[PDB]
Amino acid sequence: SYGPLFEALAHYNDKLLAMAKAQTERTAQALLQTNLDDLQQPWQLIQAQMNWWQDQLKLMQHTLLKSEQPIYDYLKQSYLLTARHLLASVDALEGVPQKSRERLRFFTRQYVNAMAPSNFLATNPELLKLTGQNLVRGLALLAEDLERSADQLNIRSAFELGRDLALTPGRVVQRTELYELIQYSPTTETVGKTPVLIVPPFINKYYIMDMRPQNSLVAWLVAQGQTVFMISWRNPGVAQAQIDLDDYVVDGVIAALDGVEAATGEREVHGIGYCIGGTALSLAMGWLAARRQKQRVRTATLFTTLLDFSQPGEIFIHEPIIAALEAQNEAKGIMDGRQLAVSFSLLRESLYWNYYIDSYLKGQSPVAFDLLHWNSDSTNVAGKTHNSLLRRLYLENQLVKGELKIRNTIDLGKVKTPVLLVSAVDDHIALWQGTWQGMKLFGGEQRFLLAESGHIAGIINPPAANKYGFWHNAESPESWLAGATHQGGSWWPEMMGFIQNRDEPVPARVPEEGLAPAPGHYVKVRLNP
Amino acid sequence: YGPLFEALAHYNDKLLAMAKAQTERTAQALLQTNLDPWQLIQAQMNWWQDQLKLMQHTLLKQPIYDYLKQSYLLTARHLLASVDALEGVPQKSRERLRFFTRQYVNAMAPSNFLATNPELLKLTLDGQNLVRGLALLAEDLERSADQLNDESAFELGRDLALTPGRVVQRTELYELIQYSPTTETVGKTPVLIVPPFINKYYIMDMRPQNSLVAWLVAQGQTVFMISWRNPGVAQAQIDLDDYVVDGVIAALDGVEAATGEREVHGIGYCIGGTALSLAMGWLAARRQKQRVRTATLFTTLLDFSQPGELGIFIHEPIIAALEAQNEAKGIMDGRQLAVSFSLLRENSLYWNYYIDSYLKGQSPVAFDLLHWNSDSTNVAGKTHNSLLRRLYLENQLVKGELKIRNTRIDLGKVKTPVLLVSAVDDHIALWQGTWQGMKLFGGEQRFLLAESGHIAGIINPPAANKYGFWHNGAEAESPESWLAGATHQGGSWWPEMMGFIQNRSEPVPARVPEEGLAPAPGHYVKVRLNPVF
Amino acid sequence: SYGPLFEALAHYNDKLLAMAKAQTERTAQALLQTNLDDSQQPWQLIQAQMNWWQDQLKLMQHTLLKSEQPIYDYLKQSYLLTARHLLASVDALEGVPQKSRERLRFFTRQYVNAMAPSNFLATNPELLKLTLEGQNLVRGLALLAEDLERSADQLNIRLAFELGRDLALTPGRVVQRTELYELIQYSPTTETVGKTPVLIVPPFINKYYIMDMRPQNSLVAWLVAQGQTVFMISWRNPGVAQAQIDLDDYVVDGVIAALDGVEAATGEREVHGIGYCIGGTALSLAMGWLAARRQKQRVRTATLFTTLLDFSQPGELGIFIHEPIIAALEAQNEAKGIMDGRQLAVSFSLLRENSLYWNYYIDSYLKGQSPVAFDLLHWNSDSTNVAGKTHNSLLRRLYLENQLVKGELKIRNTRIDLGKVKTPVLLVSAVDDHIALWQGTWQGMKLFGGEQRFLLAESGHIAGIINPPAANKYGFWHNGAEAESPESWLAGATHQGGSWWPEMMGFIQNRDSEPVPARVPEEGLAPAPGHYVKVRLNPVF
């Protein structure tokens, strides 16, 4: 039962040899084009790791076929394979500079710690067993030691935004206390009449959707003839400690819609939201509909959006813990992203295979390095916003019970905006079943899509990659999946088609000079300078 | 499971106890001072324990991939922890660790040696084609060693083989080393050590704590050591007969010239014991007065009925091809022999001679043993052919057909008391075979079985208190019958050997060696096949 | 005491008169070959120079027998001879196209500067004054070098032979290209060739085509015609990227890699080695390196032309061998990265034959050849860079410290002892050599532990080596016996006229191997001359 594994390794091994052959002719051809007045990872290092995989798999199959001393001998041979990997890895780094060598050790140490379940509190074994008021004190002691472990790693240099990441050309056309509104310059002669507005999450930074040109959702939307706007949430400081979740809905999202009208003259836009930005977009649509204002969101697309919190995945929802954090939130003013970083890990997809090995085989700068930089670029959370999200949504679940009020005002059944929900099969933060149960909350047209990966990989899958797939098409979440068909490739054309199917193109809108260039000033603020 | 975790806890607590003591050592240093990488071992211990826990967890419980993924993470954690432990380590020591680790890894690969190569077994499982398949395997194994072929080596006289002595005689085949005494009085009968000429002798003189030569000197015995020449093309016509007569007998005359004693105590190792046995048979067959009072033979093969894993080579087409190559090339290259078989195959090298050496505050003994094993020596062409055909193939010594310079050899004429010391886990000379050959002698016979492999069981100094041995004074019909009737005794067998020599006269004042020709280690031993600067 | 001078002049004058008759008939036949519908410099120009020589010698002899006013009169009459020479030279170029006028004016100016001792640092009198008694010398050397470089620079900016067409045109293929060299394998001209191929290791100070100039004096073409598979290493002209290359890399990554490349092309692990000025030194270090590591012998025979292994007498280069100069030079090489060949051009001249004008311009012209001196002058001015770390090693480890004789030299942590080399060597040196004094080369011959042969050519650094048998121009001294001193060897040696190339070929052939069918080189990577050699420091379009 190892055939597919040996085949998958042989496929990767053959692709690495082809890349080595390409490097061999490239360096040989380089000898011809030398002037005597001037002057990526080694494929040998990747080969060293591939050799470890196949030899360990061969050793395991060998020991199982042979079936106190048998356990030890396999352990000894496995240790020998570990030694061969270490020696080959060190020797492969002969010509690599020490600076690049230090960078390699950094990302590996970062990745190893991220994959360790004990190093994150939500998946730490001791507190899982605990599942009274004493636990809260123990939990704080665990966090301080876990925070120190991450801090000591950080204390003992990476990608710069605007140059290596988040480099899609655009302009900051509006800046408020809560956000910078980025309008992206077009790459087509004509674009659609209705512009697009993206509401990213305020849990981490927005550039997960604008990483590199090949996998930039924004750049892909621009190439499809669409005026793209992006909300860039502010990294909350002590001054924004008293801001509440409602303010993000009204003073953040609604104000951005008026800003889009001021920049384009359009009172209706196409909405796109992520995990909690989509939730804010959902609350904004219900707020606009409940007050019988003319509809301003033509379509709504929600990526991994939780509206029903009945299935919270991976534990803090118990009332005593929520109160203790709310008090701490008042004391500190904000929920520290460095403190929040040790609670759980947003990145748990195949990261090594599809975003380190495969991206390297495609001649790309390793995408997994970009994801680890993003994951460790944590952002604060407003104290009052954090409490509101904890009590009224995760704990009390006011939106499902119809008790949720936004500035003394929510029934999603009044929303007649067509929605498209995109969830992930391997999602650990937002269980897709919950998104399916939450899909029924809307009163208009509803469509659902399930990506064939985890929280991030299934969403950031550009068509060119053709790496994954998705299921398309009920009484239960399970009933939809059984009747759904698998479709390979990316689902981005399906979302783009959904927007275009409802409906004249306009000349490409060149954004005004605005206040600042594309990346802005809000996103560059780091917690660890 | 249980026993493995218990052994792991033993090493973890011993490392933690030794690490805590080192912490106290530096703390006390702060008080007692005038103006004028244990973490690396812990990194490896964590890998063993973490991989064992995962292995036990998965076995009790796509599933295959998860174990591979989790196993790969442990490898990555091991690399990071190992490299970080080597931050302050000097570059010289770091290179030494990289060098010896690569040696240990390649040595533990069964495919990397012809004698234990499965591919060669497949061919053995063919006629003239067998030679060609063997030649392609041999050239491939030989090529790999060159890529390995680096000044991480120990210099003789400085780190190893530093027992004080003098070279009192130099001939074409050997330098005779006489060691200076460390006692006021010594025994009347001197000691002569005949090491193997397959590898170098300093396995018996490594470091003062485990130096057999140094221990013999401290017991009040004048010790002589034959230092064989690393044979060149000029010595192509040297035969096994020459090693017996011009090597061992000539050394006996050299002992007489240096001490005035016509009888010495003989000690032989892997093939020196065979040469010492043939020398005693030669002197007895020609009715010369006995010149060897006692004989001690370590892992000595006189009956080649059980050749171990070397028996794969014992086939007429293979031997004939080697006889042609040895005659044409002149010598059997030690560089070719280094990939053929490994004299050093202890089942506990990593644990008992690397890990334990760190816990005993010693420089890792495994590094010294690997340096010795890779210090290959050539073999004379005609000598190799004689050893291949007349001993391994034809087995002339058992059948009485062996002739040493036109002198038929019968060991039954030897009336010298012999003591054979073998190793239970030996891969070169199976002890059963050594026991079968012990019956060939006509005088007093004693047998001892060491509780380890070819090297570890022999080089076990009393101070270590590491292993044990089996002794049985009565005679037995079979090796299995002897072991069943033998009694086990812990510790080293070296004190028992000294009693065998000593029980057989008032001691005389310590013999001071003459100034001689050269210092203690000599120059013959330093000749390497792959020179080092 | 002018008999020999007038005899040589009468001989040259009569040969020129005969060639003038040939040119007169040459143009007459051309008139016959006219189609109605549609080089060699004029003999009058050579006659103009010959007239100056004979008249100046006659005037000098006349004034010396007659021996203020006497000094001035000879000066005045000599000036008249100069004016008559100038008028005759210009008039001889009457119909000559402007291009040939430019080519002749260029090489003459090149020749004039080459013969001026002041124009070279090694033979400069002013720089010598500083040598006879620190930083004063360092700066003094820098101002002279910069000034000589400035003078050459203004000359260059105002500005012939294309490689593969006029020079280095022996057919072959580039079978391997690495960072340091292109391996040229030459296509055969014989039915059968020897089993053991030949590998030539040229110096990396200048370019290799001194050994492959024109078919008449091409050593490579002659070796090919004698039934030998010939390989040639073509060193890369070192750039800024190769600043960290050391002498060890040329020895190991250059020569040893070439041996593996020759084996890859032919399947032969043993070749005949041939080395020149510093390639022979690199070839010597390669044999010592292989023997010190007890690798199977890969060089069957070794022939070394003007090779320095003992640097006790560096000749006229000894003026530079001083710690303050070497320390200052090591700083420049580390900072600049490389030793600029244009700077090296003003330091010393590899081409300093006394009889260059007579034997390679006048005599070569009378043989109906394009003047060989023009080809030699293009070669000498085709300077190449030197790697910074490589130059430092050559200055300190070889010229200054002399580590190879003292046994202290290490090549990649490998001590080198040439006594371990058992390869039969043949050293060929030049009696008039100014770069590698033959005495020094003889002292270095004793370093080898195998068979040794020595040959002394009857000319300078270049003329004595590039002497093809067809020319029959010079001679050489041979002595089979071993001698205690260079003078003892020379006293016991026998002189033989002609070229020494057959002796080396006999030396190579006697040590052997039934001949094999001629090895046709694979299509390879590039045509014969390669791309590395065409790289010039002063580019030409």
Side-chain angles (χ1 to χ4, degrees), chain A residues 49 60 72 79 86 91 353, chain B residues 44 65 72 98 102 351:
Chain A
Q49 285 154 4
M60 172 180 307
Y72 170 78
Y79 185 69
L86 188 160
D91 284 321
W353 285 107
Chain B
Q44 282 148 352
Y65 169 73
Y72 185 70
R98 185 208 298 240
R102 193 180 316 271
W351 290 106

Side-chain angles (χ1 to χ4, degrees), chain B residues 359 361-372:
Chain B
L359 287 304
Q362 290 171 358
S363 169
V365 180
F367 297 164
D368 312 334
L369 295 179
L370 285 170
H371 180 262
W372 170 87

Side-chain angles (χ1 to χ4, degrees), chain C residues 170 186-190 193 219-230:
Chain C
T170 302
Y186 292 95
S187 36
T189 63
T190 312
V193 304
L219 176 61
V220 173
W222 186 85
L223 295 183
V224 167
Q226 298 290 312
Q228 298 290 317
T229 301
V230 178

Side-chain angles (χ1 to χ4, degrees), chain C residues 430-463:
Chain C
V431 56
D432 295 341
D433 203 321
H434 61 306
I435 291 308
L437 271 52
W438 63 286
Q439 288 100 357
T441 68
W442 186 94
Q443 298 288 3
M445 179 182 51
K446 298 189 300 183
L447 294 182
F448 296 99
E451 188 172 4
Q452 312 171 324
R453 284 261 319 251
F454 191 83
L455 279 195
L456 188 59
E458 197 197 309
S459 190
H461 180 62
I462 308 292

Side-chain angles (χ1 to χ4, degrees), chain B residues 146 149 333 335 378 528-531 533, chain C residues 292-295 410 413-416 420:
Chain B
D146 292 4
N149 182 29
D333 203 338
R335 302 174 275 188
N378 289 330
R528 287 190 61 93
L529 297 185
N530 298 308
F533 312 83
Chain C
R293 309 189 79 252
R294 299 190 62 258
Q295 290 281 331
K410 294 184 187 59
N413 300 326
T414 299
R415 184 174 302 270
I416 292 291
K420 304 172 178 177

Side-chain angles (χ1 to χ4, degrees), chain B residues 318-328 330-357 359 361-375:
Chain B
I318 297 180
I319 302 185
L322 275 168
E323 286 184 322
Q325 188 199 24
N326 292 353
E327 187 265 341
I331 45 87
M332 179 59 175
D333 203 338
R335 302 174 275 188
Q336 193 175 10
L337 268 176
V339 317
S340 306
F341 65 84
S342 172
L343 283 152
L344 181 67
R345 210 172 71 194
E346 309 292 343
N347 295 334
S348 57
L349 183 57
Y350 169 79
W351 290 106
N352 284 52
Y353 294 104
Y354 170 69
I355 296 296
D356 277 55
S357 319
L359 287 304
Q362 290 171 358
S363 169
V365 180
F367 297 164
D368 312 334
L369 295 179
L370 285 170
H371 180 262
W372 170 87
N373 194 40
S374 43
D375 197 350

Side-chain angles (χ1 to χ4, degrees), chain C residues 159-160 162 536 538-541:
Chain C
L159 194 155
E162 186 169 310
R536 288 188 61 93
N538 301 308
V540 180
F541 308 99

